């Protein structure tokens, strides 16, 4: 799943790859909450959750 992510994020815009990256804390190591990520990118939590719902769903087809 770690190798598939680095290709699934390359199919997303940088601003989405970065919210998923910040949230899940790939290079960060630690995990960021929905609110923190929402503060970093200046957007609501529901939107971030929509990005997650767009990325995690891409790992199917």
């Amino acid at each position: 799943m770690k190798e598939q992510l680095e290709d699934v994020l390359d199919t997303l815009t940088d601003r989405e790859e970065n919210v998923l990256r910040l949230r899940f804390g790939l290079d960060d190591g630690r995990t960021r909450t929905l609110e923190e990520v929402g503060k970093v990118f200046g957007v609501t939590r529901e939107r971030i959750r929509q990005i997650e719902a767009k990325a995690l769903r891409k790992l199917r087809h």
Binding site: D14, N18, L22, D27, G29, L34, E35, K39, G42, V43
Partner: protein
């Protein structure tokens, strides 16, 4: 906007054109990347109508207003000191604000994209910025629990950390999102440094 750093001699950039048409600029320089590339998260580059310029676009975001562009003002977007030219990658404005960011990262004690770095330095960079974030939320809740007076107890402290941070940032200081924005842009810098290795 998609910056795909290929072989570490150049890169390619995927941007929108006209009404969401797809265009790609090859032979994109990775050195002196500080100059033209925006670290904002609230802006992105868009190919000019007569495609020889990359001009800024303000995204829907509650982030601060960098680069002097507050609202996709066409008279500013089309200005030569607020847009890049394909071939001669200046910025500009972008260079100023990005230099300010690189000053902030210097203040925090994080490796910057202007000087020498390897994978180790960048890894340490992310490792430290994580500490910075954690400390930031910790302080954002610490200096918040002074009202009380005993309303916290074991009723407020109930789950979850997401809820706690929501209720705490709901009435937090206005500067918090500015600092968070700074950290965001710095994070983008560290990310650029990471993918350049």
């Amino acid at each position: 906007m998609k910056l795909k750093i290929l072989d570490k001699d150049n890169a390619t950039l995927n941007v929108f054109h006209r009404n969401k048409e797809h265009k790609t600029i090859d032979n994109v320089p990775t050195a002196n990347l500080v100059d033209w590339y925006p670290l904002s998260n609230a802006y992105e580059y868009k190919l000019s109508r007569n495609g020889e310029y990359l001009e800024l676009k303000r995204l829907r975001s509650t982030l601060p207003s960098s680069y002097g562009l507050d609202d996709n003002n066409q008279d500013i977007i089309r200005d030569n000191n607020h847009r890049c030219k394909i071939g001669y990658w200046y910025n500009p404005a972008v260079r100023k604000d990005n230099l300010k960011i690189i000053e902030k990262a210097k203040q925090y004690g994080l490796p910057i994209i202007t000087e020498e770095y390897d994978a180790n330095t960048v890894e340490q960079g992310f490792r430290d910025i994580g500490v910075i974030f954690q400390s930031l939320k910790t302080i954002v809740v610490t200096r918040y629990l002074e009202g009380k007076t005993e309303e916290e107890l074991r009723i407020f402290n109930m789950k979850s950390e997401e809820s706690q941070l929501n209720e705490a940032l709901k009435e937090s200081d206005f500067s918090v999102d500015l600092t968070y924005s700074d950290l965001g842009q710095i994070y983008n810098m560290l990310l650029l440094m990471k993918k350049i290795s």
